[PDB]
Write a protein that binds this ligand. Structure first.
Ligand SMILES: OC[C@H]1O[C@H](O[C@H]2[C@H](O)[C@@H](O)[C@@H](O)O[C@@H]2CO)[C@H](O)[C@@H](O)[C@@H]1O
Ligand SMILES: OC[C@H]1O[C@H](O[C@H]2[C@H](O)[C@@H](O)[C@@H](O)O[C@@H]2CO)[C@H](O)[C@@H](O)[C@@H]1O
Lengths: 400, 401
């Protein structure tokens, strides 16, 4: 039983959860309804687990790519904004949260990765990926490095895999073809090979995660990182003098970040759907609501036109859109979950040297094209049996 | 590296692989066939991945519990010892390697864990798990600890989980029921809760593994360990003065270790099956072949009657068979691999506090009862996607720290 008469919200711990809680305090002040904001680890995996049993938050925030899966599983209420409200957000953001003809979440922000660089170490950022190895050689001679970014999560490596031709599912005639997958074509291989060579030549290390890359950039140890607007707040605190710019090209072609619309879905099992709609439409999705969240951790570009026109005066937000426009909106289909788990494993195995690039991407292509949602529960249960065993083994020397 | 006219053998690196290579040298001296003994890591996971392609070893040594899965997948040759040869080994050993009516490996040794204890630190060993926290409190004040053993491998914790009523698959009769799994009943929970409490109360550390427990016992730092007979020769080298005895009781009931029959299977893709039969029947399964292996690392109780009658005189082998009698022979059915992968994750997550005992054993029970051997390749493809992802994540987090 989710409890009637209050709202519980889950949102990722990289986002402005404290600013969201301030909107929640204002909602309580006007309405009497208490709002509790939590940021559980792995909430995008935890949500469908607790919500399947009718528990969990009233409202879940995540990028839109997970929501078609959640909707398919019956976890998300259809939302009911009137046309006047829908006119306040850009049309392409509503398209990202439309699944089988129904709106299933409220769009909040438009997220894309950018290249973030330290202006003191590197006054003119490289326009190409190909120039990064020579730059790293130069910087290593000064005890610095050229680039560090999260290698554990395929969101960050995808822009390079997609630049020369990689794609998730082929889009044609307004539909994604779940059986036409582009993770193992010549462009995907060229980009992942380029990444793997950076690692073979010691310009990057496979054991790099978000926290490692964030610390190296914010301590002035590495000249560049790849990250979204939520990261800007810790950089601002570090006082590194940084710029936010277009991602390097690869083979003369733009990097193509997958663009996520951070969105708020309402749990199908919540008895508080009308209060959740009120909080989202009349408190959060206002200039003052989004500003409260943004002042905590930047949202980047936002779906609300009136506030996006103010935010876009900042060239960091314009650069975020410049990168977004060069990439592709994520599909929200339920097969996105298999896509990301398969690509995450492929990047990991090629980066560690466990598999060659061609072996890794061939295995990911089969895993995705032969995936069948009928077996989702079985497949996920055994993935996690493997994940907790491998995590304990990876953490071991670290205890003993 | 399987080539016609030589033999490649895989055996685990804790066993007497150097001793086995001396048997291989004798075979090469008599027959001119070269024998190469290797001990790859994770060989029991590697074999089912590579045997069906260009393999793989000619002969694989492992406890019998993995071999039903290999045989069901077509990976092992039917072996053809005549009746006179079979009569030289104990019948219950041939039952452990019989799968759907066919013999699929040669039994070698009967393995059961025992309590190993340092007589200088504990002259009389405990017969209860319940006393171990009190013995640890006294030993901590002497700069030592009571018990250390490998907590990463569920083989070592299973005797305690099974003591009060945990079981893998209900036997009846004489069929294992794959739908009737006993990892999440009150007895399984009571055993695993006792282990988790030992860790919560700082009598053991969740991260202790084989080499940490072995170094502690053999350097005289901890009074007890739980291990099999292959461990005894490193202790002999240490001159800790040790004994080998019955595992402690829990709620007055015996610990029930799962008994493995270390067995030698012949790869179905071997073009040397006649040579492997000659090596195994005429060189290894003789007093002189088993003695050579045992002199390197003890096999424990052996399946070959002539040699076991001589070994049974050693009180360490009597303790091994006493523990084996109180425990159960593992099933060899294909679903045993699914059992161990699920219980490995459950013990690891409960020990480290990532899940409660109830949640950990509930997930193992679901994983085991929903596994379907027909879908093993789909299931294992995703298990390994998870394993490599979690390994990479943990290694990155170790670098952060
Ligand atoms: O790495 C795969 C992962 O990518 C995206 O998740 C992003 C997310 O969109 C952001 O809002 C942010 O905080 O970082 C996450 C990357 O680690 C997909 O949305 C997600 O489904 C996918 O697993
Ligand atoms: O821990 C589960 C593991 O248990 C048994 O493996 C034992 C094995 O029988 C011994 O010969 C020795 O190698 O130690 C192993 C424990 O680390 C099962 O035989 C095996 O299938 C299972 O995964």
């Amino acid at each position: 039983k989710i409890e009637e008469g209050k709202l519980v919200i889950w949102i990722n711990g990289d986002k402005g959860y404290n600013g969201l809680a301030e909107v929640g305090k204002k909602f309580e002040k006007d309405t009497g309804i208490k709002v509790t904001v939590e940021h559980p680890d792995k909430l995008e995996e935890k949500f469908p687990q607790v919500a399947a049993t009718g528990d969990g938050p009233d409202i879940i925030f995540w990028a839109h790519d997970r929501f078609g899966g959640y909707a398919q599983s019956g976890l998300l209420a259809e939302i009911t904004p009137d046309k006047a409200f829908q006119d306040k957000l850009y049309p392409f953001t509503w398209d990202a949260v439309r699944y089988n003809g129904k709106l299933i979440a409220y769009p909040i922000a438009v997220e894309a990765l950018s290249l973030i660089y330290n202006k003191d170490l590197l006054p003119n950022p490289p326009k190409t990926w190909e120039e990064i190895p020579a730059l790293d050689k130069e910087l290593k001679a000064k005890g610095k490095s050229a680039l560090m970014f999260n290698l554990q999560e395929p969101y960050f490596t995808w822009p390079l895999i997609a630049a020369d031709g990689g794609y998730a599912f082929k889009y044609e005639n307004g539909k994604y073809d779940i059986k036409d997958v582009g993770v193992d074509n010549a462009g995907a291989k060229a980009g992942l090979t380029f990444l793997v060579d950076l690692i073979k030549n010691k310009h990057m290390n496979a054991d790099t995660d978000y926290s490692i890359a964030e610390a190296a950039f914010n301590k002035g140890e590495t000249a560049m990182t790849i990250n979204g607007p939520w990261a800007w707040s810790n950089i601002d605190t570090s006082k590194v003098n940084y710029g936010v710019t277009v991602l390097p090209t690869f083979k003369g072609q733009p990097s193509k970040p997958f663009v996520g619309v951070l969105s708020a879905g309402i749990n199908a099992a919540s008895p508080n759907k009308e209060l959740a709609k009120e909080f989202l439409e009349n408190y959060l999705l206002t200039d003052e609501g989004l500003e409260a969240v943004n002042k905590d951790k930047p949202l980047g570009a936002v779906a609300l036109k009136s506030y996006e026109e103010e935010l876009a005066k900042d060239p960091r937000i314009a650069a975020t859109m410049e990168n977004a426009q060069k990439g592709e909106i994520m599909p929200n289909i339920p097969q996105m979950s298999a896509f990301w788990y398969a690509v995450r494993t492929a990047v990991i195995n090629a980066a560690s040297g466990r598999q060659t690039v061609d072996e890794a991407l061939k295995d990911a292509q089969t895993r995705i094209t032969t995936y069948d949602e009928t077996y989702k529960k079985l497949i996920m249960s055994w993935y996690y049996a493997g994940y907790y065993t491998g995590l304990a083994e990876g953490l071991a020397k670290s205890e003993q």
